[PDB]
Amino acid sequence: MLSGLNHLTLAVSQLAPSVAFYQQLLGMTLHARWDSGAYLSCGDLWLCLSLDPQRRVTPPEESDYTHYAFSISEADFASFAARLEAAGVAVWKLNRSEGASHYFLDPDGHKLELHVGSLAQRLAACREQPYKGMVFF
Template structure:
């Protein structure tokens, strides 16, 4: 196993998702199947950091849940992302209760009920904090 190849999100409106990913999160669009589908439906591909994201037209999740994808960001960049996402009308959620030392998070839903998180901590920091037990 090498790791994650890509993440796919099913969305109603590919152009709206492109705006969310590119303007809100700084992704770069690299492919649009337009009228030549090679998969189940029209799709667009994006690169965010080193991660390949795919968005496909279809029926997104009917309900919101805590299932989410989290992207690593630096603490100084967190407020910049918040401003960009708020300007797009994204639903920013209140942060969950945290213990000191596990990093900061910004939780938000896209327009199709997918939950995203921007997180400033690392797995190593969280494991060390939880091992501390306080």
């Protein structure tokens, strides 16, 4: 039986800018680094950066919608988004769904998001206003 997400591994083309982004800009804790990767944590999340020459710096129009959302409080959302903006971090989508969301790109074009709100909150909103074809279990 699976009990949760164990870790998220992102392939990166250059380790130093990726460590700078996740540790310094995004404030994650750096636990270890080696010649070809790093381990960070963000709350319960175990993040691994893996140096991979096969990683392409990928424009958002050229990747699918797969993405990784980080939790932040409503109170902290706007100043964190403003930090990303000051740092020149690109946005790949505008929010049009419930709960605050900021959609931003990492140095290799990994699609990231800041989101406020849980699955329970989303399901409650969907019960009131179901998406097309929506069924609950």
